[PDB]
From Swiss-Prot:
Effect ascribed to mutating K38R: Loss of kinase activity
Keyword Metal-binding assigned: no
Name used for this protein in its record: Aurora kinase A
Record location of the Glycyl lysine isopeptide (Lys-Gly) (interchain with G-Cter in SUMO2) cross-link: K134
Activity modulation: Activation of CDK1, appears to be an upstream event of AURKA activation. Phosphatase inhibitor-2 (PPP1R2) and TPX2 act also as activators. Inactivated by the G2 checkpoint. Inhibited by GADD45A and p53/TP53, and through dephosphorylation by protein phosphatase type 1 (PP1). MLN8054 is also a potent and selective inhibitor. Activated during the early phase of cilia disassembly in the presence of CIMAP3. Inhibited by the small molecule inhibitor VX-680.
Entry's Gene Ontology cellular component terms: axon hillock; basolateral plasma membrane; centriole; centrosome; chromosome passenger complex; ciliary basal body; cytosol; germinal vesicle
């Protein structure tokens, strides 16, 4: 628990826009340690009323330690800005990869889905749910392993948008959404308006291109049920035939 300050860093390349400022490559002066520094404006956190949402997410994200979860090393603030000290993820966002490749093969998808599920299984067994399990929020390590970070309906389950009660089953719906997007190149409830997307999610209307294989259709269909109780456990996902046939890493 070292209290940091901006003078302890040399800032570099902008890595991305985080909607609340920007994330920069940085290097710790004393150690030479390379990391990522998320720069948030304090005036924009008050006036989006998320200062609690930040404090609790930072608390949670600091204690969690998994190879497929991006490490938060710490934080500090000055007058204007708050700084998150993050692991640096050399290979960037899954979003960008998907923009590049347009879509992913079954192997890369099934691997990603494993890595997610693993990091979620761990998350659940500390009573942590997530909401924004979306490509903008998944990063890639030097080995190209998936890392979850950043603790718009497109990825939200029916119970959530409807305003119903929700449990750890939200994250299962997310996996189905992502599994679909990874294979097809767009999420399954995509639309041109919010209102429509809302309808699509709420009545669970999705269809498959021809090229999506029977095994993947099975797993996605299983994951995207309206009824949370009907969605499989994470263990079952890791042990799905399509997953085990196509993944590269193993389940845990
Ligand atoms: O939600 C978002 C939108 C997407 C941009 C973004 C990126 C990071 C981040 C954290 C650690 N390593 C990296 N490496 C990286 C490497 C190459 C390209 C881009 C990012 N990037 C954190 C938060 C964040 N904000």
């Amino acid at each position: 628990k070292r209290q940091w300050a901006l003078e302890d860093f040399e800032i570099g390349r902008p890595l991305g826009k985080g909607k609340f400022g920007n994330v920069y490559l940085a290097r710790e002066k004393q150690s030479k340690f390379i990391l990522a520094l998320k720069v948030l404006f304090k005036a924009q956190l008050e006036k989006a009323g998320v200062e609690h949402q930040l404090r609790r997410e930072v608390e949670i994200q600091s204690h969690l330690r998994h190879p497929n979860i991006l490490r938060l090393y710490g934080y500090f603030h000055d007058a204007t800005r708050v700084y998150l000290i993050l692991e640096y993820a050399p290979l960037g966002t899954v979003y960008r990869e998907l923009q590049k490749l347009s879509k992913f093969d079954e192997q890369r998808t099934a691997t990603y889905i494993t890595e997610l599920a693993n990091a979620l299984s761990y998350c659940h067994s500390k009573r942590v749910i997530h909401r924004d399990i979306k490509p903008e929020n998944l990063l890639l390590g030097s080995a190209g392993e998936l890392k979850i970070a950043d603790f718009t309906l497109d990825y939200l389950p029916p119970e959530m948008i409807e305003g119903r009660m929700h449990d750890e089953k939200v994250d299962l719906w997310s996996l189905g959404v992502l599994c679909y997007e990874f294979l097809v190149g767009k999420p399954p409830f995509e639309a041109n308006t919010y209102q429509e997307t809302y309808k699509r999610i709420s009545r669970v209307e999705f269809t498959f291109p021809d090229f999506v294989t029977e095994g993947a259709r099975d797993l996605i269909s299983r994951l995207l049920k309206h009824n949370p109780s009907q969605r499989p456990m994470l263990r079952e996902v890791l042990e799905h035939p399509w997953i085990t046939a196509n993944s590269s890493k193993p389940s845990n």
